[PDB]
């Protein structure tokens, strides 16, 4: 299994650049193969537009990841095959992403000016 816990410093798990498989031949008590708890700055797992990760066995656990949107978690379920036809994943609705507004609105640039050394924007 892979467990990320109290890793205050991490904003992403992308440093695991080549990780494609978690077998779950051994699991964290409660039968978890991927477990994320109390990671105060975690905003990204992997970039699911590029990364593929497979989880053979076990469940997911997500609690107290305030900057991590449930969309990222839901994308992970899809990608990893921790498929919604099967059994549960203890995923908190209230403690994942609660301190993040996720992308929502779009700001557009009204003005752009170049100089060889400068850029002025509005």
């Amino acid at each position, epitope marked *: 299994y892979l467990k990320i816990r109290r890793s205050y410093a991490l904003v992403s798990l992308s440093f695991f650049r080549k990780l494609r498989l978690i077998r779950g031949e051994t699991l964290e008590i409660g039968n978890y193969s991927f477990y994320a708890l109390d990671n105060q700055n975690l905003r990204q797992l992997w970039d699911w537009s590029k990364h593929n990760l497979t989880i053979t066995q076990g469940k997911l656990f997500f609690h107290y990841n305030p900057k991590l949107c449930l969309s990222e978690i839901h994308k992970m379920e899809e990608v990893s095959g921790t498929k919604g036809r099967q059994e549960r994943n203890d995923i908190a609705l209230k403690t994942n992403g609660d301190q993040a507004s996720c992308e929502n609105e779009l700001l*557009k*640039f*009204s*003005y*752009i*000016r*170049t*100089s060889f050394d*400068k850029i*002025l924007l*509005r």
Partner: antibody
Amino acid sequence: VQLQQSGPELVKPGALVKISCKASGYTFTNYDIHWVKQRPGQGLEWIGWIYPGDGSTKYNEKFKGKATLTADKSSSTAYMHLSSLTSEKSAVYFCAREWAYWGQGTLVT
Amino acid sequence: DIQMTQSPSSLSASLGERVSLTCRASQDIGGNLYWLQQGPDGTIKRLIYATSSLDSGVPKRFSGSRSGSDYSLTISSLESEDFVDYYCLQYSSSPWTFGGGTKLEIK
């Protein structure tokens, strides 16, 4: 916010003429003043800009030796001098604060 | 220099009609286009910034949109004051360039 331009400007050929653009209602120093030329019955050409803070400018190659851009931060007024005028006929020149707000126009004959 | 091709150069329409003017960019300009309106007195006013964003005070009958390299200005229901001149301008690249203009005339 007001860019209040100068002219009527009647000038003899081979002379030089200086057209002003007094800015008000905002911090002069924070924005660019762009100048645009309109040859009647026709479109708009971008001349170039000035950054009143630095006095830095960029011109359109077409207008490089012709136009000269200047700002007087003490009065928050920007200027454009045209040089060696000949059979230009007439044209209307506009300054604008980064395009959102334009001045009324100045006719040079 | 990016060339902005404005069409039609002139348009006849009546009060309450919906009309569209187009600017085609010779290079991709992303969303960096303004729509300008010029009054018969010469006063220039910006109506749209960043292709689709309406400036404060501009009547909601004005809209901007993009499809491929075609940037359009649409007046959903013409009023008598709208029968003036319109110009697109690209600010995506160093030489700022303008469309050739559209004169909107009463049918």
